[PDB]
């Protein structure tokens, strides 16, 4: 696994930005750190925590759906509505369809269908105004590795290294990628920007983004520490 490697890379990137005290500059020039080409390929656009019974269902921005079940397995339904991928507790991956699957997955496929319907009828799509980055052969559709909720946010850890943090109080969100070394920030008003983290060090940023990057570092440390 490059999972621990990617989390450490992210802690590197966040520590350096946070150590530079970026909201504490004389003149902050946040816009100089923007790079629209660093926007993620994938992020979580909807989610429903039904972990008291089944697990966590979610939709990614490409309209694929997934569930992280309480037994730590994952089922993904691609946006063709037909292909599935199953990921076991130990990460072993297998491929199936709605018409070709082992009997052992029938309940979990049905659960995914109920989650899919719930999300479609009730939940707003986060990032609906964002065009995702073009995918290429080096990237694969990710699954939800793990998640947790604090009093102030839900933290979502994807299998491509990305970490997403949705804040409950004001609906602001961060998408962190340790390969781009970038953070996408969605503010309360649904405006979005993607910044190269090294450049936020140089140019600074507002107290709002600085505060959420401090919180992000603590959450990533929390993810690594449980691993």
């Amino acid at each position: 696994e490059v999972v621990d490697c990617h989390l450490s890379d992210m802690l590197q990137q966040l520590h350096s930005v946070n150590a530079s005290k970026p909201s504490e500059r004389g003149l902050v020039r946040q816009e100089e750190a923007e790079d629209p080409a660093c926007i993620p390929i994938f992020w979580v656009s909807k989610w429903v925590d039904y972990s008291d019974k089944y697990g966590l269902g979610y939709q990614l921005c490409d309209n694929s759906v997934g569930v992280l079940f309480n037994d730590s397995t994952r089922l993904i339904l691609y946006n063709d509505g037909d292909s599935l991928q199953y990921i076991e507790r130990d990460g072993t991956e297998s491929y199936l369809t709605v018409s070709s699957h082992p009997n052992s997955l029938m309940k979990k496929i049905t659960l995914l269908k109920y989650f899919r319907n719930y999300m479609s009828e009730h939940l707003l799509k986060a990032g609906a105004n964002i065009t995702p980055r073009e995918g290429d052969e080096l990237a694969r559709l990710p699954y939800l590795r793990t998640w947790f909720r604090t009093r102030s946010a839900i933290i979502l850890h994807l299998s491509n290294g990305s970490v997403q943090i949705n804040f409950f109080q004001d609906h602001t969100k961060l998408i962190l990628c340790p390969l781009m070394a970038a953070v996408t920030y969605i503010d309360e008003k649904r405006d979005f920007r993607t910044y190269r983290l090294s450049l936020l060090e140089e140019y600074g940023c507002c107290k709002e983004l600085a505060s959420r990057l401090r919180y992000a570092r603590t959450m990533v440390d929390k993810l690594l520490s449980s691993r």
């Binding site: 909807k46 989610w47 429903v48 925590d49 039904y50 008291d52 009730h122 939940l123 707003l124 986060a126």
Partner: peptide, 8 residues
């Protein structure tokens, strides 16, 4: 109960 992201 159940918790979820931002509703329509």
């Amino acid at each position: 109960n159940i918790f979820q992201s931002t509703m329509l």
